């Protein structure tokens, strides 16, 4: 109804750009690595004993991550209200403040919101490093010293390639290039026909909504490129050399290698899905605005 009911498409990363916080569970891509190590530990009797204490260590981080995101629901719904006013000309006319005033209110609340998602999760990011090191110590309890069989490592690679086939990368790449093409043409025609004689509310709402689209497109292509990397890297491992036995030190980083890739994949699959419907909902809002703009021709 020319309004946005879901603003899950915002995200924030730390100043080091190492951790990416998503509004969708599990919020962190590292949690997927923690859930995958439980599957890694399922094939090792020495590590499988500590799997019970691992869930309490991982679920607590997932609970505190889900708790910190919920604290920002006050900042979230505040921005959602300013978006619904700036993208809806009819709603913008029920209030009395100038359009430039509401844009300044939107920019202040938007960063206050994205700052909340990062600030309330700073304690969780430090816990990610600890659980990563705790996984390293659990993998040291393996019975192998210098001849660790890579069957478990390569059996997980075969599973990852099957999971990769479930995601439509070709359709996603076709979708993003096609919608990014329509988005660029929309911005460029507004440059051609813009004028400051009549009421610019319908034109201002288009550019405001288009600014949201360009952000969603940039975030969609980030995950689409990141997911492509994880698919191509794991596939390169299966098509590359297969050492029948490696040491334990290299086996720890072996699971860490495929674990990080599959984590980015499942994390990107969650984001690419949400970012796809947000771009679709944003296109319908713009076309309704375009329909409302070209609806009063005798004026």
């Amino acid at each position, epitope marked *: 109804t020319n309004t946005t009911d879901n603003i899950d498409y915002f995200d924030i990363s730390d100043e080091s750009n190492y951790y990416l916080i998503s509004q969708l569970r599990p919020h962190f891509s590292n949690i997927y690595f923690f859930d995958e190590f439980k599957r890694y530990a399922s094939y090792h009797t020495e590590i499988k004993r500590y799997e019970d204490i691992h869930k309490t260590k991982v679920n607590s981080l997932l609970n505190e991550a889900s708790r910190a995101i919920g604290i920002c629901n006050r900042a979230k719904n505040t921005v959602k209200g300013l978006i619904n006013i700036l993208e809806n000309p009819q709603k913008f006319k029920t209030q009395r403040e100038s359009y430039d005033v509401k844009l300044r209110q939107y920019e202040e609340k938007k960063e206050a919101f994205r700052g909340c998602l990062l600030n309330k999760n700073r304690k969780n990011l430090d816990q990610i490093k600890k659980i990563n090191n705790e996984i390293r110590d659990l993998l040291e309890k393996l019975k192998c010293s210098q001849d660790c069989q890579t069957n478990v490592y390569f059996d997980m690679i075969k599973i990852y390639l099957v999971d990769f086939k479930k995601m439509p990368y070709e359709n996603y790449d076709t979708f993003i290039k096609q919608y*990014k093409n329509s988005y660029l043409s929309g911005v460029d025609m507004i440059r051609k026909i813009e004028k400051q004689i009549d009421n610019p509310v319908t034109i201002n709402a288009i550019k405001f909504t288009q600014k949201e689209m360009g952000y969603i497109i940039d975030r969609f292509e980030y995950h689409l490129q990141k997911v492509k990397h994880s698919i191509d890297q794991v596939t390169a491992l299966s098509d590359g050399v297969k050492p029948k036995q490696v040491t334990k030190n290299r086996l720890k980083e072996y699971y860490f290698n495929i674990g990080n890739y599959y984590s980015i994949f499942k994390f990107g699959k969650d984001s690419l899905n949400m970012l796809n419907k947000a771009l679709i909902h944003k296109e319908k809002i713009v076309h309704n605005l375009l329909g409302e703009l070209f609806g009063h021709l005798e004026e």
Partner: antibody
Amino acid sequence: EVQLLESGGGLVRPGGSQRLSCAASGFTFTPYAMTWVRQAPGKGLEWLSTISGSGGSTYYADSVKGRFTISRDNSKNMLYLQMNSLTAEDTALYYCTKDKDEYTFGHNAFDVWGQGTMVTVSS
Amino acid sequence: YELTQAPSVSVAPGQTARITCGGDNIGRKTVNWYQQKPGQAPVLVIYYDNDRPSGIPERFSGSNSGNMATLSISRVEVGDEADYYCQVWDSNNDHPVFGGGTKLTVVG
């Protein structure tokens, strides 16, 4: 004041490699799409490569495709151009730019320009 | 997309200089103009056919319709002597493209 600063340009033998950098300051570097554009001494401007904000989109000119790679670090406001297998026809002065708006992917004007670093390829 | 620009255009001071930029249907796409002084960096002078960045004198105007996009400099002084380019977005190649450039020389 938004400013773009470039370096790394120098003399390189044909077939060698060179890494150009574009230092940004005075503006939010992440949302804007940065661009590389070179200009041969005497000749006109020539677009080379533009990159999206998040880095998920990278464009390249046919003259530099397969040899040049564009990249950015959104935590240091830096912007790179890795040049490989340089030929004599690559000797030019290289500019880096930014779209005047955000989330545009090179479909904009280029309001801020660097001073340009000089790449020379000869035996 | 090919952008044809005249190599050189001259003008006396006080007069109005007209830099041109041709295209098959250049009135369909926005045109941005730039100014590069000798041994200097390009400066955006006009964008989106007729928009003018802040700080650019009012003497710099632009037109774009059909097959011709023209940049106009009025009350020309010796400080306008520079090179002027036009930038367009390639539709089917998906990248910007610059014109050959027009060298404005002030005479008189």
